[PDB]
Amino acid sequence: SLYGQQQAYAEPFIEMMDTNPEFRDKRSYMKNEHNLHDVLKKFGNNPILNAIILTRSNQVAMYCQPARYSEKGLGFEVRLRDLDAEPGRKEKEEMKRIEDFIVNTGKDKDVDRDSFQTFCKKIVRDTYIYDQVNFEKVFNKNNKTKLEKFIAVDPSTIFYATDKKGKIIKGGKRFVQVVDKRVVASFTSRELAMGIRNPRTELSSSGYGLSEVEIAMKEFIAYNNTESFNDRFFSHGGTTRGILQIRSDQQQSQHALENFKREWKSSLSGINGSWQIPVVMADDIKFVNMTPTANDMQFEKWLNYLINIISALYGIDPAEIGFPNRGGATGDPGKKQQQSQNKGLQPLLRFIEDLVNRHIISEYGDKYTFQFVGGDTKSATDKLNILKLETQIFKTVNEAREEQGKKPIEGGDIILDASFLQGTAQLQQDKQYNDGKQKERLQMMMSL
Amino acid sequence: SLYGQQQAYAEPFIEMMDTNPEFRDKRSYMKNEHNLHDVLKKFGNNPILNAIILTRSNQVAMYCQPARYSEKGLGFEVRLRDLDAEPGRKEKEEMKRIEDFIVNTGKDKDVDRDSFQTFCKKIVRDTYIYDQVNFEKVFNKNNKTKLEKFIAVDPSTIFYATDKKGKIIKGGKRFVQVVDKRVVASFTSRELAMGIRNPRTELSSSGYGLSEVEIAMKEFIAYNNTESFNDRFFSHGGTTRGILQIRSDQQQSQHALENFKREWKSSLSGINGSWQIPVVMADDIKFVNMTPTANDMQFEKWLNYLINIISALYGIDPAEIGFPNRGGATGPGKKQQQSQNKGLQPLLRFIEDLVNRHIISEYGDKYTFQFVGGDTKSATDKLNILKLETQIFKTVNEAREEQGKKPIEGGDIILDASFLQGTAQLQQDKQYNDGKQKERLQMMMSL
Secondary structure, eight states: OOSSOOSSOOSOSSOOOOSOTTBOOBOOTTSSOSBHHHHHGGGTTOHHHHHHHHHHHHHHHTTOSBTTTOTTOOEEEEEESOSSOOOOHHHHHHHHHHHHHHHHTBSSOOTTSOOHHHHHHHHHHHHHHHSOEEEEEEEOSSOTTSEEEEEEEOGGGEEEBBOTTSOBOOSSOOEEEEETTEEEEEEOTTTEEEEOSSOOOOGGGTTOOOOHHHHTHHHHHHHHHHHHHHHHHHHTOOOOOEEEEEEOSSOOOHHHHHHHHHHHHHHHSTTTTTTOOOEEOOSEEEEEEOSOSSOOOSOHHHHHHHHHHHHHHHTOOGGGGTSOOTTOSOOOOSOHHHHHHHHHHHHHHHHHHHHHHHHTGGGGOTTEEEEEEOOOOOOHHHHHHHHHHHHHHTOOHHHHHHHTTOOOOTTOSSOSOHHHHHHHHHHHHHHHHHHHHHHHHHHHHHHO | OOSSOOSSOOSOSSOOOOSSTTBOOOOOTTSSOSOHHHHHGGGTTOHHHHHHHHHHHHHHHTTOSBSTTOTTOOEEEEEESOSSOOOOHHHHHHHHHHHHHHHHTBSSOOTTSOOHHHHHHHHHHHHHHHSOEEEEEEEOSSOTTSEEEEEEEOGGGEEEBBOTTSOBOOSSOOEEEEETTEEEEEEOTTTEEEEOSSOOOOGGGTTOOOOHHHHTHHHHHHHHHHHHHHHHHHHTOOOOOEEEEEEOSSOOOHHHHHHHHHHHHHHHSTTTTTTOOOOOOOSEEEEEEOSOSSOOOOOHHHHHHHHHHHHHHHTOOTGGGTSOOTTOOOOOOOHHHHHIIIIIHHHHHHHHHHHHHHTGGGGOTTEEEEEEOOOOOOHHHHHHHHHHHHHHTOOHHHHHHHTTOOOOTTOSSOSOHHHHHHHHHHHHHHHHHHHHHHHHHHHHHHO
């Protein structure tokens, strides 16, 4: 079973003839193709797709540092789940250790290992080419409970393992690595993550993702063809402006024509000849125009249209990648473009977070959470304004100073409001009155 | 193994026929070519690519100086990791020493060595041509643990070393330098860095990067061709406006035609002849137009389009590189900062990453290297801030002490009327309680 014991079938009830009993083939949407990822790999060098992958991956790269050490606060942090909790002495160190581990992508520092930045770039590229991310988790050999490394794995090699009965294996070796159509490795759900952004209920989807390269494939082919068409003007075309027809009773001999070519080039070619005009006395001379007087690229609108579609599928503004937005462009916040960048980033960030939380942090238990965090508008000005209100509403001078680590002062312990002091000045007199009253009561009692 | 012990294979399981058993070839994406870097070297003189490389490197060069000595605060700094720590007496000097070492690119000052600026410009060029940066780390001869120099190395000469079993070496001499297809040097992972911006999981990528020059190569070829086409009008073309056909019962003899050319030039050429009109009595005269009356460059849109693609791949605005924005309409954070955010910020973060992993790690994890921008902390802003802190936190004397100015009698007070009214209350409270206690004592002695 794919998820677990259920009475609804989640896979094709009759076992389709998979090429191998041991793993599920990555069938194309229409089942026209069984080796889909080897098809898609051919598009991984497309310039538009690479412009998208590079811009997205470079945007995401900016969060890979810990926010803790980043003075602008940008980056990621490992946090307690509850916002209301205060971390214990050991919990703060555990969170710092987990942060360091993630940064190093492993327990020890090792220049031979990917940094987290390289990991994120890899999985971004993999999502946008294949819609399949895999990374292996390697546990300590002496202690299987202790995680040592996580490494990103080539998604084109990872397949669901299938029982001889055609059912996807659960609980056992759920995943296999296949090279040259033989299984070279196997993995449990514990040892390998799989992440998919475009899930399907479709039974024949077999739990695999859905690449935008598959959906847009017609558009990519049309694009490629129009690019080749426009390029072949130089590479293969006839640029010849026209034919100079000279006509007389009989064609000139080849010798005559070649020394006429010599008179021509010796009199008219290059800058040296540039403004001379030949005089010719043939019976008639005609020039036939075979190309437009002014050549330019063709099918520009077609290209724009196509790229607008592809961008709309990937969820990016064409203007971000140097194309006119056919939607008419035109959309404190930074910029509306900044909001559009949030539109692209936020799903991708959430997907990364989800994967990290499910697979890595879950080794440390549910008390922690992994989140990316943006900066904050909490300058010294903002902090001073905030505390300038808290000191009217809540905080005595000494509490404020304590938050700075500055010694409490005699004459603190007061709210900075004149009404508060007028109250305390009242209460002092009230005390002195009650003191007098009670002393005179006692004096009368002693008199009586 | 490429990264470390793993049960998933990260390299071709069957050893592919590499040209040399000792290193992994830098195969082109499609494996159509085996000498990719010798292909890319031919583009290093491209004017567009050089405009990109020069603008980016010039931008980066502004940060090379230490921020510490630059009153505008612009530059780099070496810092403690924790923001909460206050540096010890020895830590401040160690940080200054590390900064100086970086500036000098080495332990001693030596005019023969690259400055940090030259190193930056080099690695920038290498990233944008090859997507591969390498620099060697040279340790002290007496103490192998002590770094003395770091020097940038030609990335086209650096290859991954491979075991005889076709596996990439780990722990040993992971890298070799190959010149003329012979090994001239070898390196451990400790001695040579490799940095790549465009990693791939693809097994056949073999851990190498991916240059945009490889991806954009068709566009570069189309550009070159369109440039040659437009240039060849002058260099090679026929500019001839047209043919003047004169016709009569028989063609003129060559002698007649050459002395007619002499009458022509002697009567009509240059400024001297410029407004005269010839009268000619031939049977018929015709002029055949062979070119447009007004010539200009062709395929301008094609150029703009190609350039815009290359710009989008490189993460640069067409505008700053001499071309218009095909993106269309141009309509605290600013629009101009978007062109830093794409490109420039990643490049800085990449350089920081390399510096931290490879150099600072010699000094241990307590320090961090970072580039730092300026700050909006003029005397006005600092005085406004302290003008608030003196209401919220600071007595007059604490402020003066932070300036190194002597405390004054009558400081130790917050500059708020409510604070003083409080202390004026407390004084009376004290004098009352003093009176009460003295009268208590006097009564006890009376009783």
